[PDB]
Each structure stands twice: as C-alpha cells, then as structure tokens.
Amino acid sequence: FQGMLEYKREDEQKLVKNLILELKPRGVAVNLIPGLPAYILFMCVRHADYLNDDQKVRSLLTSTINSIKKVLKKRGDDFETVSFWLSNTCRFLHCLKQYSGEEGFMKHNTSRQNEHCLTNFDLAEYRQVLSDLAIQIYQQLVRVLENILQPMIVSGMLEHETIQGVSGVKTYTLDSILRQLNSFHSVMCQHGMDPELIKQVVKQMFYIVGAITLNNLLLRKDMCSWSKGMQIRYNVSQLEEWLRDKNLMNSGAKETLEPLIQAAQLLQVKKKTDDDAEAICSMCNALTTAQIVKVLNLYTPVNEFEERVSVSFIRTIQMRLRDRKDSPQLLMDAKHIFPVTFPFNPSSLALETIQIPASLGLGFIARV
Amino acid sequence: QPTRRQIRLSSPERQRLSSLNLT
Known part of the structure; x- marks a missing residue:
C-alpha cells in the first residue's frame, strides 16, 4: 500500500458529503485518529496527482473547500464543529506543505514520507487559499x-x-x-x-x-x-x-x-x-x-x-501623564483579535498505515 | 524533485474560494 486513495469522479459529491458535510465530530474513528478527514482528503489528492489529472485535482479541492465552508455556515455557531474543522483545515494545509516536495517543508520527514510527496502538481495557490480561510475560521471560533x-x-x-x-x-x-x-x-x-x-x-x-x-x-x-x-x-x-x-x-x-x-x-x-x-x-x-x-x-x-x-x-x-500620547479611550477594545498564525506542523503519521473505518461510509473509495 | 505544474486559479475563483462567508 502506497498511502493513496482512489475514487470515481462520479462519486466526488458522495465523498465530500460523507467525509465533510455529514461527518460528526464525535465519531469514534476521527477521535481515535485526530485529523483523519484531512489525511483522507490528502490521500485522495495524492492519487489525483499520480494520475496527472488537473481537472480531478481542481474538482476535489473546490469540492473540499466548498464543503468545509458549507458546514461552518450551517453549524458554525457550534464550538465543537468549528474547532473540528479549523483543526482539519490546518492539518490539510500542513499535509499539502509536508508532502509538497519542496525542500524547506521536508526537514522533519522520514525517508518514507518523502516518497509520498506530490510529483505532478504544485498546489501553492490552494495552500494560500487554505491559509487565508484558516484566518477567518479562527476568527469565527474566537x-x-x-x-x-x-x-x-x-x-x-x-x-x-x-x-x-x-x-x-x-x-x-x-x-x-x-x-x-x-x-x-x-x-x-x-x-x-x-x-x-x-x-x-x-x-x-x-x-x-x-x-x-x-x-x-x-x-x-x-x-x-x-x-x-x-x-x-x-x-x-x-x-x-x-x-x-x-x-x-x-x-x-x-x-x-x-x-x-x-x-x-x-x-x-x-x-x-x-x-x-x-x-x-x-x-x-x-x-x-x-x-x-x-x-x-x-x-x-x-x-x-x-x-x-x-x-x-x-x-x-x-x-x-500629559506626556503620554495617551488614547482618551475609557474602555478596552474587547473585540480585538491578535493576528493569528499557523506555523508549519509536520506530522509523524505514516500515510500507508491509515485505514478507512466502515463507520465513515466510504466503501466506494479504494486503497492504493 | 521534478518540475511540477502550478495549478493556477483565476482571480474571481480565488476570491470566491478564499472567502469563508461565500457559500
């Protein structure tokens, strides 16, 4: 097993329905392995890269991002939902960096993890989209x-x-x-x-x-x-x-x-x-x-x-205190949000070990 | 390391994707 996942393009909407839109943050599988939805989506990205299929990579990323935004709009008043998707949006971004094949992101990789880098597509524009989205999802959480x-x-x-x-x-x-x-x-x-x-x-x-x-x-x-x-x-x-x-x-x-x-x-x-x-x-x-x-x-x-x-x-x-350039403000700005950052956090998780539990309803995807 | 293709977004597509509230 190479740590990739294959799906038919016809099933892409069922993939994101089951892995994102309807996925319960309290489920057993995703609590046993934190970040599991992000790792599974990345393993799917790997196979579309392997196929050198631009249109499939583009479709999967759009479907993934749109589905995370849909969940956060519909249920974004719920702390656990927002935490969960912020965590998984970040882990998906970390995977796209860790397995980009760019030398600066590979310093903490095992030999085997370097073998799992993407080989056909530079997804830097999507990494920037995800980073920009993570800032807004963090503001929503706060x-x-x-x-x-x-x-x-x-x-x-x-x-x-x-x-x-x-x-x-x-x-x-x-x-x-x-x-x-x-x-x-x-x-x-x-x-x-x-x-x-x-x-x-x-x-x-x-x-x-x-x-x-x-x-x-x-x-x-x-x-x-x-x-x-x-x-x-x-x-x-x-x-x-x-x-x-x-x-x-x-x-x-x-x-x-x-x-x-x-x-x-x-x-x-x-x-x-x-x-x-x-x-x-x-x-x-x-x-x-x-x-x-x-x-x-x-x-x-x-x-x-x-x-x-x-x-x-x-x-x-x-x-x-006249020498102060003191603000005449009486109240603290209780709405201030300190600018957030998402420093790269590579993972030791070995993709080839990841199993897909039956409980996620993803029987139509295949381990490659 | 191979030479990879940078997947290019259009500016309107980038704007839509990166706006959390457009959904």
Missing part, C-alpha cells in the same frame, strides 16, 4: 468561544464574592469560568488542534476575560474598593494557576490580563502623597490615563474614617 463565556465573566470575576475562593459569611462563579475553559481546552486537544494554535486561542480568550472584566468595572459604581481588588487579584491568580496546570504559561495569556491586574493593584495602593502618585504613574503602564482616573474617582473608602481620593491627587496624576 467569536463562538466569546459568546459562550460572555454571560459568565462579570458574575464569576466580579459579582461572586469569595475569601480566597471560599464562601464567606458576609449564578456563575469563578469555577464556572474555569470549568468552561477546561471544556474548550479538552475539545481542542481531542480534535488534534496544533499546540501553537491552542496557545493562541487561550491567549485570546484570556484577553477577552480581562477586557470584559475591566470594562464592566469601569462602567459601574460599586466594584472599586479594597475588597474587590483583593477578590480580583485572587481570581487572576487562579487563572494563572490554570495556565500552569495546562503547561500554557508561555502562551502569552497571563500578560493579556495586565490592565485588569494593574486596575486591581490601584485599588490597593496608597493614594495620598506625591510619592504615591509617582508610584501609580510608574505602575500603571498598561492603563490609559482615563482608566486610571476613572478607578481613582470610583474608589470607595474602606470605612467611614477614610476620605475619597482627593480631586487634587487625581489632577496630579492627570498632569504627570
């Missing part, structure tokens, strides 16, 4: 994950009171958020998403959690107190622990929380003297002037003995 998290954020990060996580004497909780992040991470891993892509997804969703949290704090009257600063610092420390548990500290995710971290620190720091003001100006390098001024204006005294922050103290901070 918005689906945001919509799921959004109702939990303020309740769990701000409204739910704890004492270092424990109910105090004195709806969604911090634990709700962490369990939901757990679910997102589990599903991406089950789908074989690239580790470098999972890192980006996690950085983006930490950015969203921090930005929704800080904007909500800036827009209400009751979240700027010593007590709430303590709570926010605890909650962020558990988000950092989640990263450590997942071995994701190098994702950049913790750094995206710096504006919320600094706002919470402003709730704790001394707020009286000119040295206190200088310290705030050096500390708050991830908050705009308007954000610093808002938190200090909102700050609630810890008891009846404490005065509100004085207006002259706030003015001192405003005056000493």
Whole structure:
C-alpha cells in the first residue's frame, strides 16, 4: 500500500458529503485518529496527482473547500464543529506543505514520507487559499468561544464574592469560568488542534476575560474598593494557576490580563502623597490615563474614617501623564483579535498505515 | 524533485474560494 486513495469522479459529491458535510465530530474513528478527514482528503489528492489529472485535482479541492465552508455556515455557531474543522483545515494545509516536495517543508520527514510527496502538481495557490480561510475560521471560533463565556465573566470575576475562593459569611462563579475553559481546552486537544494554535486561542480568550472584566468595572459604581481588588487579584491568580496546570504559561495569556491586574493593584495602593502618585504613574503602564482616573474617582473608602481620593491627587496624576500620547479611550477594545498564525506542523503519521473505518461510509473509495 | 505544474486559479475563483462567508 502506497498511502493513496482512489475514487470515481462520479462519486466526488458522495465523498465530500460523507467525509465533510455529514461527518460528526464525535465519531469514534476521527477521535481515535485526530485529523483523519484531512489525511483522507490528502490521500485522495495524492492519487489525483499520480494520475496527472488537473481537472480531478481542481474538482476535489473546490469540492473540499466548498464543503468545509458549507458546514461552518450551517453549524458554525457550534464550538465543537468549528474547532473540528479549523483543526482539519490546518492539518490539510500542513499535509499539502509536508508532502509538497519542496525542500524547506521536508526537514522533519522520514525517508518514507518523502516518497509520498506530490510529483505532478504544485498546489501553492490552494495552500494560500487554505491559509487565508484558516484566518477567518479562527476568527469565527474566537467569536463562538466569546459568546459562550460572555454571560459568565462579570458574575464569576466580579459579582461572586469569595475569601480566597471560599464562601464567606458576609449564578456563575469563578469555577464556572474555569470549568468552561477546561471544556474548550479538552475539545481542542481531542480534535488534534496544533499546540501553537491552542496557545493562541487561550491567549485570546484570556484577553477577552480581562477586557470584559475591566470594562464592566469601569462602567459601574460599586466594584472599586479594597475588597474587590483583593477578590480580583485572587481570581487572576487562579487563572494563572490554570495556565500552569495546562503547561500554557508561555502562551502569552497571563500578560493579556495586565490592565485588569494593574486596575486591581490601584485599588490597593496608597493614594495620598506625591510619592504615591509617582508610584501609580510608574505602575500603571498598561492603563490609559482615563482608566486610571476613572478607578481613582470610583474608589470607595474602606470605612467611614477614610476620605475619597482627593480631586487634587487625581489632577496630579492627570498632569504627570500629559506626556503620554495617551488614547482618551475609557474602555478596552474587547473585540480585538491578535493576528493569528499557523506555523508549519509536520506530522509523524505514516500515510500507508491509515485505514478507512466502515463507520465513515466510504466503501466506494479504494486503497492504493 | 521534478518540475511540477502550478495549478493556477483565476482571480474571481480565488476570491470566491478564499472567502469563508461565500457559500
């Protein structure tokens, strides 16, 4: 077996119906081998290349791309569906690179894998189409994950009171958020998403959690107190622990929380003297002037003995930050998406070992 | 490594294929 798959051109629409349009992300076969639909489609591309059949390669690629776009339009509100197709679009792109026969993409190949390179067609124009599509599919995933998290954020990060996580004497909780992040991470891993892509997804969703949290704090009257600063610092420390548990500290995710971290620190720091003001100006390098001024204006005294922050103290901070080219924006842009990349991730999977389970309904294709 | 044929897309075909939302 050479690691190719043959099909009759008459069956191309049934191929993509069964492998893409109607394929269930929870099926046993594709969970035993993550990326299986991408490997099978690539093995089909190999045989059309072997035949030197331009029109068959063109038809298969168009049918494949159109079918992935159709699934994501119809069911693209579903996290598992979007994760699954993002993962498989990426793996299909990696296969087209790894088996292109271009020297730069072959550095991690076995001898046998090099024997599986395409021999008749340069598919660089389709690789570029797939890369461009992957950017948009990732944006779709980010918005689906945001919509799921959004109702939990303020309740769990701000409204739910704890004492270092424990109910105090004195709806969604911090634990709700962490369990939901757990679910997102589990599903991406089950789908074989690239580790470098999972890192980006996690950085983006930490950015969203921090930005929704800080904007909500800036827009209400009751979240700027010593007590709430303590709570926010605890909650962020558990988000950092989640990263450590997942071995994701190098994702950049913790750094995206710096504006919320600094706002919470402003709730704790001394707020009286000119040295206190200088310290705030050096500390708050991830908050705009308007954000610093808002938190200090909102700050609630810890008891009846404490005065509100004085207006002259706030003015001192405003005056000493004038040199900033500071954006007068009060709110973080919670819709920002960090530009995503898909670094080449070759696979050790040996194509000649791939079996086609009966459960996919692909009996009409043949191993070559 | 053989010389391979680059499969060329037209610009309208490329635009349609690479637009996620056209479907």
